[PDB]
A paper describes a structure:
Bacterial periplasmic binding proteins (PBP) are receptors for extracellular solutes in metabolite uptake, chemotaxis, and intercellular communication processes. Solute binding induces a conformational change to form a closed state in which the ligand is bound at the domain interface and buried by the surrounding protein. We have characterized the stability, determined the ligand-binding properties, and solved the X-ray crystal structures of the apo and ligand-bound forms of a thermophilic periplasmic ribose-binding protein from the hyperthermophile Thermotoga maritima (tmRBP), the mesophilic homolog, ecRBP, of which has been studied in detail.
β-D-pyranose ribose the most prevalent form in solution under ambient conditions (59%). The ribose is wedged between three aromatic amino acids (W15, F16 and F172) which make extensive van der Waals interactions with the sugar ring.
Author numbering: 1 to 292
Write the structure that this text describes.
Amino acid sequence: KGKMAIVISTLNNPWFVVLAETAKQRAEQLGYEATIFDSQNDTAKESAHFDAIIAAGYDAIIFNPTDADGSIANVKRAKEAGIPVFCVDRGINARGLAVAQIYSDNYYGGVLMGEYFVKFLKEKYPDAKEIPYAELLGILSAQPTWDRSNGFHSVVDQYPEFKMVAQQSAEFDRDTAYKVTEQILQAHPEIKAIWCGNDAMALGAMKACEAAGRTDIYIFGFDGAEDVINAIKEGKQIVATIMQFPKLMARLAVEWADQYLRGERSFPEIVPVTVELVTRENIDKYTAYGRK
Ligand SMILES: O[C@@H]1[C@H](O)[C@H](O)CO[C@H]1O
């Protein structure tokens, strides 16, 4: 057997709880001990985890980086120590240092949502000369933040009726998104929609919109997390999200670490995992964190 370290960006995100626990469970099912290390969105805490993990002689690391550039020195240190690293959900801007990186096709998720954003909103406001909107960005040091925003804009920018009047990071965080949205609503009451880089931000934005009596603002998220599935299902003002498949990601990452540890050496360096569009029209095909 042996032991696997599961190092996660933060556990203050329902989606990362699922990702981390699927990995831990899969490691255990394959006969490893496994420990989850919560970095709390802090690259310094992540580095302390990597020190401790190296000292404890862990056999493999399942890694979700706080910073696509800054987390590289942690990976390098594990590698020097002979500990293979498998990235899950976020990648690093390197190569060779991770055996494999498995994460979603986040650009394509952005494109899927940009399309539905345009479609849903032109349908609600066919004659409007401007449809003003706001974007909540994820954590700026996370690859998915930009992949999703870039992909979204690749579509929505082609439709100049849509005017992005505010753009700000809410750190992939619900309470942060609440405060940020509360400030955005004061400064730009004309917005008719909010596109958010993850579901936690969608939920914070919704709470803020509801508090101001602004239940007319259509909110668009990303992840397929429990309370966003629920919101969409209950007919609330979050009308869509992009389903990711953390259970698949986590499972592959652990299985490959096991396979690596008995000599398997051909894994691809980058594996994109597909995503799907969730709407009011198809919500019944989905549950929290996956299909059914
Ligand atoms: O893919 C994940 C999820 O969107 C999470 O909610 C924030 O971190 C991203 O890397």
